[PDB]
Structure formats: C-alpha cells, structure tokens
Design an enzyme around this catalytic site. Structure first.
Site, PDB file in Angstrom:
ATOM      1  N   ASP A 179       0.859  -1.161   0.000  1.00 63.34           N
ATOM      2  CA  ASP A 179       0.000   0.000   0.000  1.00 63.34           C
ATOM      3  C   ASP A 179       0.914   1.236   0.000  1.00 63.34           C
ATOM      4  O   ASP A 179       2.095   1.129   0.334  1.00 63.34           O
ATOM      5  CB  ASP A 179      -0.832  -0.009   1.269  1.00 63.34           C
ATOM      6  CG  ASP A 179      -1.978   0.924   1.230  1.00 63.34           C
ATOM      7  OD1 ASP A 179      -2.418   1.373   0.127  1.00 63.34           O
ATOM      8  OD2 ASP A 179      -2.481   1.156   2.370  1.00 63.34           O
ATOM      9  N   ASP A 213      -0.225   4.945   1.141  1.00 57.04           N
ATOM     10  CA  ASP A 213      -0.472   5.878   2.254  1.00 57.04           C
ATOM     11  C   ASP A 213      -0.215   5.212   3.598  1.00 57.04           C
ATOM     12  O   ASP A 213      -0.702   4.122   3.870  1.00 57.04           O
ATOM     13  CB  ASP A 213      -1.906   6.435   2.226  1.00 57.04           C
ATOM     14  CG  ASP A 213      -2.130   7.486   1.176  1.00 57.04           C
ATOM     15  OD1 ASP A 213      -1.246   8.260   0.810  1.00 57.04           O
ATOM     16  OD2 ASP A 213      -3.294   7.604   0.761  1.00 57.04           O
ATOM     17  N   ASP A 263     -14.247  12.922   4.566  1.00 56.64           N
ATOM     18  CA  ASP A 263     -14.246  12.389   3.209  1.00 56.64           C
ATOM     19  C   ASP A 263     -14.127  13.503   2.172  1.00 56.64           C
ATOM     20  O   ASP A 263     -13.323  13.408   1.236  1.00 56.64           O
ATOM     21  CB  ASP A 263     -15.498  11.585   2.945  1.00 56.64           C
ATOM     22  CG  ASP A 263     -15.504  10.240   3.638  1.00 56.64           C
ATOM     23  OD1 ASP A 263     -14.463   9.782   4.219  1.00 56.64           O
ATOM     24  OD2 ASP A 263     -16.592   9.647   3.587  1.00 56.64           O
TER      25      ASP A 263
END
EC number: 3.1.3.5
Lengths: 472, 472, 472, 472
Positions: free
Chosen positions: B50, B52, B204
């Site tokens: 991954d 991040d 978000d």
C-alpha cells in the site's frame, strides 16, 4: 473405550465432597476445568445450560450409529441406491469440525486461517502435491458458505462419515462416471452439492420428522449418559445463584430426557427425597432457536405443560413458579432473572451457535463442554512422547531434509492415534480451526460441566496474560 | 518526540550493509520485525505494498493537524458555529482504534470482547460506576455498525479528536440543551448520530474534493517522511522476487508522492544512477478500492500515464512494461505475477481493510506497519517498571482491597505516559481490540517495513507454538 | 346453484361439433371466451395448462367446506379453543380477492388503487365514517406485504371465512378482551397478525401434511368436476400444436386427479378407444414451483413414474416419449418444445402467480379460468336492471342528495345478490383490484377453458383499441 | 414549432376571466385538462407542485442542446475521443420513454407489455426479422434493471440522442471493432453497459457539479417558459385551499428559478402589487429526494434562507410563516397541512417518480404535466386522416396481405410526423408503455397545469366507466 465410556465411568462414581478429596480429584486432567480467560466464580450469579450434548450426553458410538442408520434409511426411501443399506457407521473415521467442500466432494481439516491440514476424497487421503490441483494455495475461504459447510456439532458426526461413504460408493460403482464436480449416471448428473443437500435434508428429517427421538427415548440407558452427581451440582449452583435452561429442543422431548437424567431414588444426595427436574431451574425455556435467540429471538410463548402444546398468544406476564417458556431471546433471560451478561455462565457444547454467539453478541461468560476431550486427554497423555519428539524435530529443523520426511511420519503416527481424521484440536504441530475457536470464545472448557463440582463456590480460575511479541 | 520524528531520525541514517552491523542493528526493538506467525522469507516470491502510511508515512502531528483544520473549515462552511475555528488539534488526546458510540456520543476504548476499558464524553473521562448507567454490562456489540464506528486508521486521528471537541463544545455552550442522545437548539435537535455523520462526510470531502492533497503536495518535506534506504530495500526485494503496488489512491497523487519518495541524487545506493519510482515495480495498480479488491473487485482499467486519466474500456491485454492498472482485484495480481497467495507478502498499515481481508479472503502473508510503534516502544521500555509493578500487583491480588485502588492508580499512570487515551495496544494489563487484531491477522509487524532491510534474504521468522490449556 | 353446479351441468352435455351449432353455442355468455387483448389463434403453437382449478375444478361448496373443516381441526389440535369445532363453512360470506389487514383484523375489498370498497371486522360490516378511524384516507398500500395479505386463490376461500369466524368468535367470547390489534387473555396477547399466521400455517399444513389430498382422492365424484369434452378439446389442440402440463402439484396427486379426469369408457369422442391422460401431453412437468418457475426456476429433475419418486440427479437429457419432468423453469418448456413466448397460450386460474408472471416475465399469451364466472354471469344478466339503474343514477347525479342514499341502497342490493362480500369484479359501479388485474394480464378469460372448443382452429379473438382521452 | 414554442405562445396571452370566454377556451384541445379518473375539484383542499418541467418548463430544443453539449464536453474531458465535439443535438431523433438495452446497445420503444415497437442501433432502424436475432420473442422484461434503463424524464432527452450518436460513432470509426456487446480498441473493450454508465454519470455530473445550472440561470429568458398567468392560477388555488411546493431541487436554484417565474411588474393580475414567490405557498419543501419521499423520506431539516444552507439539526417545530423545509417525507406535508391523500392534487411531470409513487404509495390525486403534448396535439389533429385510415385498415384486415404492407407504410408515415422515434404515446395503432402509465396513474393530464385556470373552482372532471368484456 469411547469418550462416552470415560464420561459414564466417571458418572458412576459417588461424590466425595471432603475438601481435600476434591482438590486432589481436580488435579487430574480428566476432572479439571481448563481456563482460557480468567473467571471469578463469585461474580457468577446465573448458571445457564443447553440440554443436548451438555446435560444429555449421548453415548458413542451407539447414538451416532442410530443417526447414521436412520439417515441412510431416509435416503434409500427417497430413491438412493440399495447399496447404501450395506454401509455401517465407523467411529474411527470422522473427527468433528471438518469442512465439506461441495464443489469437489472433499472433507477438509483446516487450521484457523483456512490452510489445509488433511484432504480426503471418499476414503482416499490426498497427499500435498495432488491437493494443489484443486487447492492451488492449499487454502479455502471458509465463509464462502455457498461452497463450504463446516461440520461443527456432534450431531454432524454421522453425516461426516456418510458423505465420505457416498463419495466412495459412487466413485467405485461402475454405473456412474466420476467427474470433477459430481457423478454422471446417463442423463442424470448428481453434483456433490446436490448430494450434500440431500444428506443435510435427511439428517434434519430424521431429527424433526423421523424416528430418532422415539428410538432414543425408548432406550435411554443405551443412548444417554446418566450421572447421580448432576443433581448435586445443580443444587449447589442454586445455593449461590439462579439456574436456567435454554434449549433448542421442544418441551415433550426435553421433559423425557430431563426426567431420565434425574431418575434416581434420591434427590441431590443419596438419602434425600427425589425432586422433579423442573425444581432445579429458576427459568426453563424451550424452542430457543439459538443462535437467533442471541439477537432478535422470537416471540415469547408459554408452554401448557399438561399437553406439551403452546398456549395461544404472546406471553406478557412475569416470571412465576412452574411456568415454562418457549422462544423469546437472551434478553428475556436477563430481564426475568435480573442479570447482566457478565453475571451469567452459559454452559454448552455448540462452540459456534451458542458459545461464540452468547460471548460476541451479549458478553456472557462461557463454559464449553467438549465430550471428546474425555478420551482425547487419554490419547494426549499416553502419546506425549510422539508430540514431544515432534516439538524437538521442529526446533532442530528451524535452527539449521531427512528431518522433513521424519516430521511427516511422526505427524501421521501421532494423528492416527486419534482416528483417521486425527485430533479434534490439531494435526501434528498445527492447531485446527476448532481449537482456535475454543481458545477464543470459551472462557472455560472441559470434557463435562460436572467438573465444576470439584471447585469451591468462589474459586478464581486463572489464565496467564497474553503479551504481544514487542512486549515480551 | 512524535513517532514520525523517530521514523525520520532513523530514515536519515545511511544503510551499513555489513552483515554484523545488520545483525546488531535488528537486535534493537526499534529496528526489529516482530513475529506472530512463522514466515520463511525464502518462500516469498512477491512483495506488495500500500502507499499511504506504508510507503508514504505522513509526519505527526503536522499532517493530522492539517486534516483537522480543513475538516473544521468544511463544517463551518456548511453551517456549524464559528467557535469551531478556535479548536486546535491536540495530538495528546486521540489514540487510534477508539469506537465512537453514536447513540450516547462517547469515545470508547475496548478489548477484543467489547469490554469497556475507557469511556470519554467530550473531555470528561467517565469512571466505572457512571459508565454502568449507559453500558449496564460494561460491554458493546461492536459489529452493531448502525451504532458504533471504529476509528481504525491513522486518517481517523483528526476526527477522533474533533468528535470529542464537538461534544465538549455543544455540552458547554449555553445555546444548546444537553440530552441523552444529542443537543436541543430550540426547534432543532442535533443527534450525536447526525453530528458524527457530518464529521465523517467532512473528512471524506477534505480528502476527495477539498484541498488536503494540494496542501500536502505543495510541502512534501513538512508532511511526508523520506528515507534514502527505501530504494535500497525495494531494489533488494526485486533481486529475489517481484514487487507490486496496490493503492486506493489515484495515479496523479500516487505519482506526486512516489516521485518525492524517490527524489534523491542517486538510485538504490549513493553513487548509483537515479531511476524513476515506476522502475521499482513489476506491477502498479491504483484506484484499488480495497477491501472490495479482495473479493469481486472492479473492472480492470488502464491508466493513460501522460494525462492521468483512464483509457476508455476494460483492459483485456497482458502485463507489459510501463503499463499502469486501475481497479481490478487481488486475482489480477495473482494472475499477472503468476503467484499464489502464500507466495505474497503484502505490506500495509490498514489492519482491517487490507491486512485482515488479504489474510482471510486470500491467504496472503501479511506485514503490518504500525507507525505509532516507533514511539510506543520508547514508552514501553522507559516505563517498564510501571508495567512490571502492575504484573506483580495482579499476581499478588490473585493469590489472596488497598491493592485494587493501587492497581487503578498504576494503570492510570502507565496509560497517561502514552496520552489521554493510553496505549494503542492496552489499558494497564488489558489488551485492546486493536492489539488482538494485530496478533490475529499480521504475520509480521513493525514500526516501519524498512526493518526488513536488516534481515537476510532467506531469513526464517519464528513465532513460538501456541498450546491449549489442556495441552500445557 | 353454485358456480361448480353450472360448470358440471355444462360438462354433462356431449359436444355437438356441427359448425352452426358451435357458433350458436358460443353466442351465449356462459360458453363464450372473453377478450381483453386481440389474439390470433393460428399463431398459437403450444397450449399449456395448470392442473388445480383449471383442469381439475373442485366442486363448491363441498371442497371449500372440506378445507375449512380440516383447517379448523388443525387449529384445535395445536391448542385453539374447542368452540372452533362449532363453526361451519358458509359459502355466502367469502368472495375471492379480499385483503386481510393483520394490524386491525379486517377483511377489505379494494379497488385497483387501494381504495376501500367494503370493510368487515368479523361479521360486522363497517360503514364509511367508522372506517376513517382506522383508514383515514379510506386507502391501503397493498404491497405493504408485512401488513396486508391478499386472498387471491380459490384455495384461500376457506381461510377468508375462517378469519372472519375467528375475529367474531374472540370478540364475542367473554374470556378475551378486544384490543385494537388483537385479543388479551390474561397474560397472553394474541395479535391479529399471530392469529393470521396460525391460520395460514394450518391451511398449508392441511394441503401438504394433512388429510386433504387423501380425502379428495377417496371421493373424486364429490369433489371434482368431470367433463367428457376435456379429452376432445385436448385432442384438437394436439392436432394443431403441442400441449403441455406445468403444475405445482406432485406426480402422485397429479396422476390420481388426471386419471379421474380422463376415466371414461372412450377417448376423445364416444366410440373411440380410451387413451391414458399422459398421451394428451407432449410435455408433463410437476413440482413446478410457480411463480419462481418464470424466473430462475429450480433444477430440472426426472420423475420415476413407477415409484412416484424423483430420480437422483439433474436431468440433462432430451425430451423423450414418456418422460415426466419435475421443477425446471419456463425456459425448459420453451427450449424443449422449440417455442417462443408468444407461440404459447398458458391456461390457468392463478391471476397473480401464473397469469401475471407468465405475461410480465416471459410474454406468454394467457387464458384465465375464473370458475366463479359460471355463476356470476347468471347474476349479472338476471340483475341487469339494478346495474342499469345504478348507471342512470351516476349519470343523473354527475349532471347536477336524495340521490346519494339511493346510490348506496341500490349498490348494497346489487352487491348482496352475489354474496355478503359482493361480486368478485366490483362493488356497485366500482371495479375491484381483481377485475383490474384480469383486464391487465389475461389476454382471454372465461368460466372454463372448455369454451375454446366452440371456436374454430384459427379464430381471431378481437378486443377494441384503447384510445387516450386526448385521442378520443 | 417546438412544444415549448406552443407553451410560450399560450403563456404570452393575458387571462380573460369572463365565464363564457373560459368555457370557450377549454373546448380547444390545447387548453383542455384530460381525464382518466373522475375528480371532484371541490374535494381538493391542497394543491402541490414539483418545480422542474412543471412550474419551470425549460425551452426546447435549447435546453436539451445545452445539456447535450455539456455532457459531451464532460465525456471528452474524462478521455472520450475528440470527435464527440462534432456531434450536435438533434431534437428530431429522441422521443421520451425509450429503453436503452445495455447488452446490445439498442434504443427500444416498447408497449405496456414489453413488446418491441421500434428498435434502433445507433441511427440504423432495425426491421422486424433482423430484430428476432437479438429479441427472439420481440419482447423485453423491462424490470430487468441491470440490463434495461428506461429514459422517462425530459432530462433524459439529451442522453437518449447521445447514446445513439455514440453507438453510431464507434460503429463507423475504423479504430474500433464492432462486437455483439460493445467495441474492441486493441486491448481495451468498451461494453455498451460501460458506455451507458459513463453517459449516465456525465449527465448527473453536469447537473450536480458542472455548469448547467449556472448557464441556465444566466439566461433564463432563453431557457425557461414564463407566464404571467402563473401567479393568477396559484392565487386562485390559495383562495380555496392550501398550496405547497415539494421539489428535488436545492433552495438556491429553486429561489433563482421561482424568482424569475414571478418577475413581472405586478402580482396575480396586472395592476396588482408584486408579491414574492414564497408568498404563494403555505409550505415550501426543497431537497425532497422523491421517490424515497413517498416512503420513509429523510430527516426533516430547515433551510437558512439568508445563506441557502441547512440549519444544523432535525427540525422538530411547527409550520410557521416564512419557514422553508428540506428533506422530510410526504407524511410531513400531510401532517403540517392537515390533509389526507385524497384531499391533495399533486402536479408534476415525472410519471414514475412522482405521479406513480404518490398515487400508489399514498393515494394522492395526480395531475400529470406532459410538455410534449402542446405540440403532439397539433400533429394528432393535423394528421387525423392517417390515423383514421390506419383504423379502417385494421378493421378491414380483421374481417377477412397487400393490406399488411399498407398497414406498415401508413404506420411509418404517421410516426415520422412526430419524429424519428414517433409519438410519445404510440407507434401506429399500438400504445406505448408511457401512454399506458399515463392512463393508469394520472387522474388528470395536460400539456400545462395552467389549463386548470379555465375550469371553475368546483368543476367535476368526468371519465367514463370502464366495463369488463363480459359486462359489456
């Protein structure tokens, strides 16, 4: 010697309640309560029970064999071939907790991560390399419930064996052509999935519409372990807390079984007046529909105990002496007994449907009965040298290929001491899924809940603290 | 000293690849890889990442503070009160893995079984007895996802603090009346549930439509840990296996971040030619949509790397040099790299969404990056005397009430060394849910995946066997 | 005179197949086929049938009464009160297509838009204003299937009456207290919803596990209409196309019933050799599980017609002479007969489960049998003066309050000619939901499918074009 | 002359409210209200409105063209080919209510039963026999919503045309290979399903995140029909009942549009003081989220009309002057206005999402605005001779093959008068799905709701009774 033979041998002994005798007795592995999570018995205010394979432990292999026979007879009656009638139950084959793969028709024993430990197609035990053809990563995704069915209850032992019998039979019968996902019989194709569903349906039928209950109740001494210490333990529990029954079984069957379990010429101890089984419970609930019971449940009903039928309507009244409940939810129990979850020790054999769900959904304390442990412990101690050699081989290998074939051999010889599908708890040095679930969801476990009789009222069961690798 | 300060201090050191130096270096807890399951590195054929908080570790508290500020600004822009602008991020409050209870507006730290360890309403830490009013069994059913949200990622740290700030603010603001499930402002009722949803929506929004990415990329040295040893480790992995990237992030952001992470005047070692970041990967996949990625995934697309846009259509072609994928599924990776799950070591920080799902759904091997460990380990070793006293008090109590208040005091003092919500891994002697999930689903873990650099190519990571109580 | 008396009187007549006689005969409403959509019979290549209430029309009220009695006996056997045994079926009460409201315990007759036409609580017919208390908009949302059950089949006639009997009984029995949503009997509360579910369960039980089938087959002349013209019509259909049976019933019951329906001393015409019922069908499919049949269906199985059991496996072979199918889907029929949907005329009584679904899901042509029409048509023609007066009153009112009470009176008197719940098709001038569904989903309809015998092979059934208001 | 040209020509006329003039005016088809169900206006106590294409009728083809252009520009911006920029909207192609088949990339016009009336692939109109290859029964199952999308709103007109443009473009562009289910471009495969989703996404984007609203509001005279009779009609409605707005649109857009619609130098009549648009409504509700609005809806919020933002919290207060609501449900309206469903006439253009749902779920009375009728009625009357010839040909054929080719020719010539996809309401003598839904769910319909102005307050709209075939 079966596990139920061990249980019944211990059942036949009277209780010596001298404090030194008790302490000496529970030293022995057979009479011990094992501890995964610390539990202060003084904090327990309610003791709850399942009936089947908890209070009423069915004798082995006789009860499995009866189930097997009736299930076979049902399949033949719906059109399976007559050769099925020549099968005979073999207790040396099945171990509990196997996974039936409905795609490829295999029984699999897996670890907690879905890794294959054992794979059998019928009675052919498939070696590692041949396993890779169907399981390229030697792994299954066990919650793919459309494909995999985990045979987790003692009621599933007969069908575990029957599935293997059927795969063997169809494979070796020249009328059928073996295909990757089932069997071709001209213009009929029987997939392993359809075969499995038929078996599952037949087992359910035998229990709910067939003669299994009737045949059990007509010979309870053949089929059910009986222990005069049962009323003693329940009476002692009732001195310090409340006692309840929450069973999936119906009232009529429950009453037959429980009446038998308490049919001695005395009550709690020899010399005391006999008391009806119902008198040992503050709350009796049948038709529980666990695991749904631990969520929304069903409507609370009252049993008319004269007829064995339900009274018409939802029961809205209070807890009263002599009332028998049907349905409801775990909240019914909490409300009526004035308990919070951690005040309850729930005692049962169903490691998913009762123990896992009561713990996860409600935070109840849990005591798992594992009847097979009564014999597995004898094998464990008798064959300790094989396991210890296995440990020493794993050590010696890790700090370092004649060793690898040796690790396989000893693993095989060890496992075969338990049966063809090995120990409930492991294959060689690898723990099963079932073992992992016991460690995770059972606070306490034992071969029988009777082992609680040997610990004093406010005993503190201790488990060692778990530290992370970086904390160690 | 934050955990990212520790990580960056170690990042600034050049790699001494002498074999004795490496062995000495990985003795230290800070540079060690910790082992929950045995893993033979020689069997790993693919290393996956991954991006991040794995490759790109955002600096603390600066990055959380930026997230917090932008989220606050978004809420004010949609009509929250101006007083929100006076909040300022405080890294001493949140610990990762807390549960927000949307019914009662509390942050809860829980153990693996849903038992309450800590309960705070705003900034008021509620004691045991007051907790029973709202949590009668000191327990929550954590998979009641309509009620409970578990704040498990490092991206959730700002909202963890913001939720407490908002509960505090509304509670103490005389315009609002505090009610059991939210706040009354005349004819408006703001439930904790609606407030939580607003916060979640705003976080978000900041990530996907607001300025967080832009503000990060305009000052990467402020916001992102950079380590010249990164290309060395990736180049070594590529000598023995394949290397892949599977990130939820989009290509444009991925390219900015990865370009920064590789922007040194050299390639793998000082003195070597610089090579583009893409050259370190056999397969690059963006817009992964994990966790769905580990099931059905989404349609496989190709990135036009000139424009940063997707080519129109599903990509049906083979793996080719220079291609960048978007969407797809974990099976894409397996197919294109010719790997089975156990050949893969997947390296990430997201203990649910990547590590748990890759393990459970696919049987991948897992390496969990826990950035906070880089500082938690310093606290653990510096305050070992408090934990050891706590162990000795638990021992002394168990074999036997001035001790109980003492157990609370030492538990409090220990926990406060980590922050107001204590260690990520425990409160006193009780392990958190997060700790349990690490032990269960991460084969290996460390403060940084760079610690793999200090172990040789075919190292065998060993965990001790787990025995059941009756086996011990 | 019941509708089945009318059907049997017509059944007893031999077929006069002279072309003028046929044309004269089908002029009469009783022997006519009614047309909602134009249908060119020459385009029909397959004729398909349901069995129950289509080929096998059960005699009224005898069959409803048997169903009623057995359902009552089942409820008493599970603990309903003994007074139930004093109920007796009354064919003058129920009309098909009523809605049971499980909240308030009412039977409702509604129009196509959910508007209330009639509301009865037990045997109390509630007037307009009293209806508004429970139905403020005189409207129900009929697809709220948790609350409303629509009693759409002729099998639902006994339970329609039984529901009203039970509401009456509990209301007037002093042991129970009437509440808005059910009845209180001390600490038991029986909601109308629980009562309804018991009734539904009991009806299902009588059909599938009780003695209804057995009692029917032991006296077929009492219970089933028989018509020597049936084989004549089926033989004529087979001259121009294929003929199939697709029934929810099982093979054993199907064989008993069909054998009876064809048990004459001749075949298609007097003087011809008798032929077995199976010889009239190109395809016979039992256990159809309609309506699911019209979507995914179930696995295609073959019946062993010697035993009445299913062969083990999915049937993968071709259509062959003498084979009997079980399960499958509507696509099985299309594939095996080489038909597209519009080549098929499907003949049945179940206006939802067969006619609506075959039309909507597959575009089959549809012929709805409505057995009650055989008597409703006599009432319609005999009482035409009441309807015409009603029309003239609606006219006279619209072009303009002694008229409104008059409209109610005539509406009541008209409706009562049909029974207590009025016509299947209307209350006064308002059409029922059932009427609307007939018009929408049945291409053709009649009191019996035998009426097809009176039209020539390539007859064109014509319906007038529907124009919109702005087109008119 | 477009339908909006007709509407605007009628809008420009002042209201002559003399009773004879009104009666004369509504004789004309253009100014008439058409009646499917009888409706007594005196029973209507609340008049409710949608805004878009009801109060605010967007001018054609200018508004469709703007939508088309912006949608094209969005697709190009995400990577569709530059040639898209050469498309130009053509109002002669799309008719509302077409079905896009995502499997085969066709636009279909269907009847109420899913029978194919017209099938076009790009701009190629496929004849009957070629249609059978993909549609063997000339039928689709229209509620297979994974495959079929019904383009039922006037907002869907641009995408209707764009879908055909794209299928044409890809088919004829030599870079792509046409396949049965989409287009191959080397190693990229663009299915018609993926293409359709891109189009749908882009249309949504243009409306919610792009410049469509901005471009509309900057030139309202170009884009929106304006009628000084609007405030007169609303003021008259308010004399006899309550008036409400329930719109999916947001407050800021609603305020811009409504302010424009009321921007005259007078109020209800010339010479009267101008009044703000809000003063014409007893209740104003935005962000309605219909159709969900007619079930559970969403939380009731209040708009801060100064900022255009929502106040924080659920609104729990009463109806008060000047308040603007957001979200809620149809029950909010009923409660706040003290209305039952049948007291409400709901006026809108969305025949599924508003009219069908308000009728089916709540029993509201319905008035459907069909803007295209303003021009379709001119075609209907001007070309009446073609339809009448078609009727006479259907008659002459039925009572009896040079006639069949003649029926096709006249059908084609008739349909082409409306456009390439024919009338909204029919193809030749066959009614469309859309026509059937209008007849079924709209009590009243017209080209504009302004036509209500020409009927007196307590007018009784009459529809003739529907009789079944056997009743006739």
């Amino acid at each position: 010697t079966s596990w139920s033979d061990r249980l019944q041998n211990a059942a036949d002994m009277p209780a010596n309640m001298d404090k030194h005798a008790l302490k000496k007795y529970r030293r022995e592995a057979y009479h011990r309560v094992f501890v995964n999570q610390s539990l202060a018995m003084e904090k327990i205010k309610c003791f709850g029970f399942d009936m089947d394979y908890t209070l009423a432990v069915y004798k082995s292999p006789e009860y499995e064999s009866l189930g097997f026979e009736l299930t076979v007879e049902r399949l033949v009656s719906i059109g399976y071939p007559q050769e099925l009638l020549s099968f005979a139950y073999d207790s040396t084959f099945p171990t509990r907790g196997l996974v039936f793969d409905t795609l490829y028709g295999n029984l699999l024993k897996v670890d907690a991560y879905g890794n294959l430990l054992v794979c059998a197609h019928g009675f052919n035990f498939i070696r590692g390399p041949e396993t890779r053809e169907q399981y390229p990563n030697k792994f299954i995704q066990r919650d793919d419930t459309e494909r995999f069915y985990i045979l987790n209850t003692l009621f599933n032992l007969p069908e575990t064996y029957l599935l293997a019998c059927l795969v063997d039979f169809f494979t070796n019968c020249p009328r059928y052509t073996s295909c990757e996902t089932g069997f071709k019989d001209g213009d009929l194709f029987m997939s392993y999935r359809s075969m499995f569903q038929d078996v599952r349906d037949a087992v359910d039928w035998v229990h709910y519409k067939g003669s299994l209950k009737e045949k059990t109740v007509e010979n309870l001494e053949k089929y059910v372990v009986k222990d005069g210490k049962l009323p003693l333990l329940l009476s002692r529990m009732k001195e310090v807390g409340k006692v309840f029954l929450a069973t999936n079984s119906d009232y009529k069957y429950t009453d037959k079984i429980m009446t038998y379990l308490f049919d001695f010429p005395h009550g709690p101890k020899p010399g005391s007046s006999h008391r009806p089984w119902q008198s040992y419970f503050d709350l009796i609930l049948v038709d529980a529909r666990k695991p749904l019971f631990f969520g929304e449940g069903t409507v609370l009903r009252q049993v008319d105990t004269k007829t064995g039928k339900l009274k018409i309507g939802t029961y809205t009244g209070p807890l009263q002496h002599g009332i028998v409940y049907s349905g409801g939810s775990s909240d019914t129990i909490c409300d009526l007994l004035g308990a919070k979850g951690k005040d309850i020790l729930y005692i049962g054999d169903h490691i998913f449907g009762d123990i896992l769900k009561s713990k996860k959904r409600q935070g109840w304390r849990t005591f798992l009965v594992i009847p097979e442990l009564a014999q597995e412990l004898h094998v464990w101690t008798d064959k300790s040298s094989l396991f210890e050699e296995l440990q020493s081989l794993d050590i010696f290998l890790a700090e370092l290929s004649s060793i690898q074939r040796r690790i396989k051999k000893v693993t095989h010889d060890m496992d075969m001491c338990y049966g063809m599908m090995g120990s409930l708890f492991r294959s060689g040095s690898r723990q099963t899924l079932f073992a992992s679930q016991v460690m995770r969801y059972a606070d306490l476990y034992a071969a029988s809940f009777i082992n609680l009789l040997y610990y004093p009222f406010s005993y503190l069961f201790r488990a060692a603290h778990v530290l992370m690798p970086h904390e160690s």
